[PDB]
C-alpha cells in the first residue's frame, strides 16, 4: 500500500518587501486543481550531420498554479501580492525585486523550498458561472531555483 492523498497540505508564502513575515494557504479550491506545475526541461539535444547525438544543458524555469476558494483571506492576500507594483522600492544588487519564497509541506512530512521568483498572472474580478456560483481563482508563480527534502 502507498498513500498518495493530498488532504492536510499547507503552503506558506513569504515575499521580500510586501509580506516580510509571510502568510499561509489553507482554503484550496474544489472545482479546479489546487496546486499544479509544468514540466521541467533542463536539457536539449541536437543532431549531427552523420546521424549522431549531442546533449547539452538549457536554462529551465519552473511554473506553479495555485487555486483558492473565492472570498477567503487567501484570495485577498494573493490579490495584494498581484497588485504589488514591481517598479517601486529598492532592491539588493542582483536579487530581483520581491524575491518570493514558497515552502510547501506534503501530508507525510516532506517539504519543498522554492525561491528566487515572483507572481505573474491571476484574476482581477470574480467570475459568476452558469450555475450561480463563483469560479475558483487561480494564480501562477514562476521560480528560478528549488530544493527537496523528502524524509520525515
Amino acid at each position: 500500500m502507498i498513500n498518495v492523498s493530498g488532504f492536510g497540505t499547507g503552503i506558506v508564502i513569504v515575499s521580500a518587501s510586501s509580506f516580510p513575515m509571510g502568510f499561509s494557504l489553507s482554503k484550496f479550491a474544489d472545482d479546479e486543481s489546487p496546486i499544479s506545475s509544468k514540466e521541467l526541461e533542463p536539457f536539449g539535444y541536437e543532431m549531427l550531420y552523420d546521424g549522431g547525438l549531442f546533449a547539452f544543458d538549457k536554462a529551465a524555469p519552473l511554473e506553479v498554479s495555485v487555486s483558492v476558494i473565492a472570498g477567503s483571506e487567501d484570495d485577498i492576500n494573493l490579490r495584494i501580492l498581484l497588485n504589488s507594483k514591481k517598479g517601486s522600492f529598492r532592491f539588493l544588487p542582483g536579487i530581483i525585486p520581491d524575491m518570493t519564497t514558497l515552502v510547501a509541506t506534503l501530508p507525510d512530512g516532506g517539504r519543498t523550498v522554492l525561491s528566487n521568483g515572483t507572481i505573474l498572472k491571476g484574476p482581477a474580478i470574480d467570475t459568476i458561472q452558469n450555475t450561480g456560483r463563483r469560479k475558483g481563482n487561480t494564480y501562477t508563480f514562476v521560480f528560478g531555483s528549488y530544493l527537496g527534502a523528502q524524509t520525515a
Binding site: 543532431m47 549531427l48 550531420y49 552523420d50 546521424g51
Partner: protein, 86 residues
C-alpha cells in the same frame, strides 16, 4: 573546351557550359547529396555555320607578322640529309 547541349522535357538548347556547383551535406539527407548546378549559354553570331566537305575547298586564314625564330643547325648538312636521304 567542350560545349554541351541540354534537352529538357520538350526544349532543346545548345552551346552551354557549367558555371556553378553547390553541394550540400545536412542531417536531412545522409545517403544522397542534394546538389544545385547552373549553366550559361555561349552567345555567338551566325548560329548556323556553313561547312565545306573538301579540305582544299576552303577559304584563307590570315596569320600576320611572326618571326623567323632561327635556331637551326647548319646549311650544307641539312640539305645533304634532305636530298641524299641521310
Amino acid at each position: 573546351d567542350t560545349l554541351y547541349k541540354v534537352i529538357t522535357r520538350g526544349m532543346v538548347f545548345e552551346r552551354m557550359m557549367c558555371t556553378s556547383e553547390a553541394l550540400n551535406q545536412t542531417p536531412d539527407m545522409i545517403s544522397a547529396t542534394p546538389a544545385r548546378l547552373t549553366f550559361s549559354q555561349v552567345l555567338v553570331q551566325n548560329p548556323k555555320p556553313i561547312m565545306f566537305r573538301n579540305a582544299g575547298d576552303s577559304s584563307m586564314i590570315d596569320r600576320g607578322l611572326a618571326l623567323a625564330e632561327d635556331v637551326v643547325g647548319s646549311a650544307g648538312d641539312l640539305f645533304d640529309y634532305a636530298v641524299n636521304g641521310v
